[PDB]
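Regression check, nickel (II) ion case 953:
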Amino acid sequence: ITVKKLGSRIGAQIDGVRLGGDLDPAAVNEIRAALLAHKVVFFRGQHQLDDAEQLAFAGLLGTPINRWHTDVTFAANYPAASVLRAVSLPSYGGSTLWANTAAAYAELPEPLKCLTENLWALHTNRPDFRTEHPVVRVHPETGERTLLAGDFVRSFVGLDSHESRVLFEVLQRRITMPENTIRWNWAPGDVAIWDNRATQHRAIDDYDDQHRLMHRVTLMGDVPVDVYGQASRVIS
Amino acid sequence: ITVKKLGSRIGAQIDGVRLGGDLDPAAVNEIRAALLAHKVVFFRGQHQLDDAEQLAFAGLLGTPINRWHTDVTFAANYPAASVLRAVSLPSYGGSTLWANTAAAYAELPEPLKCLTENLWALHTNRPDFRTEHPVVRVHPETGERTLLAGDFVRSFVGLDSHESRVLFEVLQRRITMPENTIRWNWAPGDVAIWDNRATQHRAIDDYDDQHRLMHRVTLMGDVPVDVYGQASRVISGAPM
Amino acid sequence: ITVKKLGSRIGAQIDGVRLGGDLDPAAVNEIRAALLAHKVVFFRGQHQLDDAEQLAFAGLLGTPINRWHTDVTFAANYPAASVLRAVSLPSYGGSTLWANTAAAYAELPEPLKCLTENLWALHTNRPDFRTEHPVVRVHPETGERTLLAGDFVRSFVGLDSHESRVLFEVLQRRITMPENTIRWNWAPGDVAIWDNRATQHRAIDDYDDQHRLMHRVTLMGDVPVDVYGQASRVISGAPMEI
Amino acid sequence: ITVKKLGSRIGAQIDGVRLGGDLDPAAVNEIRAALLAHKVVFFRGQHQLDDAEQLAFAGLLGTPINRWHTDVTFAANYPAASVLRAVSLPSYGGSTLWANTAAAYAELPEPLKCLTENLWALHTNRFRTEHPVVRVHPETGERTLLAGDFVRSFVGLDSHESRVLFEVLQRRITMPENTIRWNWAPGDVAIWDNRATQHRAIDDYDDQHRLMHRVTLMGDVPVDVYGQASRVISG
Ligand SMILES: O=C(O)CNC(=O)c1nc(Cl)c2ccccc2c1O
Ligand code: NI
Ligand code: NI
Ligand code: NI
Ligand code: NI
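Current build output:
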């Protein structure tokens, strides 16, 4: 079970594993360890997988349930991870991006850390769901500080509309800087696992009207907490 | 001596005082108190003041030496205050703007305080002066925090070009909010005194190609210190 | 009747006129001419005016009915001008800002004219009025081109959120530039008249929470037309009546 | 001899051709067509190349001489295309991005076309040259956005506006749907049309070594839609 490093700050490929429900404990711990470290992990050659096999494999890692986003951040208890499989890919394009929000934080100048540590964003959906998340959250498992932003961010608490947009785009520019991202060229039998609590992702609509079907199993999450132990606030 | 507020966050007009080199200590203590409190103070009908009589008066406040700026912040020990007198005005226009950078800091959300308190800016003169000032200085006399920025800020330390211009303009917008500024319509024999340690100012070129003349006496200042007690840093040049 | 510039781009003071319904028709022509030329005009020491006499004077100019805005641009036929009179001023502060959107357009570099001439904007009251105005309207009387924007602007047609807000701030920066504005220190008896088809205005809340009250009389305006001659489009809400 | 589409707006892979001076002109015409259509073209498994044989193939196209840029736009007669080859790659990362500035222009809302057609940018290195923001491509006749990180300012606009409009343009240009990210493998060769693209290196390999051999071709002076050519300030 080798783990190939793809990029300096994000992405790893994992060889010598056949994803499925009947897997070894020691194997799973290598996967989680690689997931937490590299934020998104990839599995080639997984042509054995159907839905039920992918769902059973997800059950080991946790509890099963365009533009840059963390999935469902308008909700308070937003997903921990996702297992995504290709079933039907187009003849060209259809690649996907991931960004490491843990490394994003780490590389912030200390002034911007000061800012973000104490900053809170209003996440919403465009049935109206509203959550105030901290822009910085501590990762339950790794204890890493990770920026929490993305396209569900409506505004920052306290700041006016102009300041919100401007500061928002400042963070996203760092979060999605090419060095801090990985772009995956999907082939059949590929499976990506990403930590939704330390990443943003983005689909790319570069395959025209071609069909592109994927199968996604999303693991259960938990309410974020900032560096002062403050958890997220609900409204709607 | 009576002092009248002009706006809620800045400006005061002081009557009952003829400015000159020979003034009562108690009176100059009331002027300074008003200057520190209101950041800019205006004197009507000071027709007796010529260059020499102005220079004298300024010497009771300290030691004698268009875009929103704080005067000469590309130097480490930039001036504390200035006395500006009108002599030849235009027939219309030619007002001047002042911004209270102390009230600006106070109005900030806590997130932007965190930022500004720890943010440091490189001020330059496009002689090659270069100075790393804090974005927040503690005022030597009032102890108030004041935002230190303006048109001499080339960049912020640790941030790139884009982040800099972005945050620069975010700060300047809050500083130059109309409610945090005052526009002075110059009449002849008007004298303005402003605290350069707690303000920005801007001249308005709305008098076409008419002649304009003012007389400025600028006072010696000290090196700023951040909220932790760290001084500004001379990269190039020498103190004033 | 004298009319005095208060600035190169905007503002003028008019003295030598007792305002009221019994005004000399030739004097009204000079008022109107000044208003169109200088965008906002001020009268000092008009202590004789009241609600009734102001409304009467207004009727000679046209038909009667904080942050930078043109008045009620969320409607299609937004006012042509307004007459504003002080009744009760605070002891300090309370000054008001005007910006010249005609001068603003004139100063635009050619590329930015290309953009603005061809740019439309959705205005809204944040009742549910929603209107697509041109960012440049041709002025009925003067024939001048004026930038039409302000705080009611929600977005620009054909452009996404980021682009819209970015370009919006580009224009507002030019409009509200100090050179292109005037700030009025209100005294009792002061009256201000401005052309709402060629200006934005902004109240300044720099008087804490002291008591302030003005009285305003607003005139009827027409629907803006772009340089090509296309008129503003109503999406929701009725035009202004009376 | 086949050419495969990599993404809707940009990117092509050309398989079944050995690059070098020893190539049928008929193949060169099929390669040039792809380069003009797809803006960047990729050759897998070109293990048998070297500095001499890359240069010979570059001559068949024309006349031989990190952040989002078009190469050497501070110059006026800046390059037409480049042939880049991997000689020694890091163990991980080292990818490169290309953006299609022709597709960028086409996607613009009509108001932004008004602007960009009439807009001019001062390009510089930290030489100086005033280029049109929209150039007409000499071969294809397509209108392409011309910007990148050599742009200091736009002619007639102040610093703030220039800066703020610049990011509006670059944001569209570098929109993922308009780009391609290439994972470099041994013996890979890319040719890109520098007149219709931007490119960006990705420094995501810590302190590792990515040696690349580039061969750049001669390119003519840009012209705007009105026919006005670029003005040189500092030659
Ligand atoms: O005092 C002033 O600056 C004049 N006020 C206005 O033009 C004005 N405009 C609008 Cl759109 C509103 C809108 C709502 C309430 C008061 C308003 C107002 O006084
Ligand atoms: Ni998603
Ligand atoms: Ni100055
Ligand atoms: Ni109004
Ligand atoms: Ni290059």
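Comparison notes: The first helix of chain C runs from residue 25 to 38. The helical segments of chain C are 25-38, 51-58, 101-107, 110-117, 161-175. No diff flagged against the previous build.
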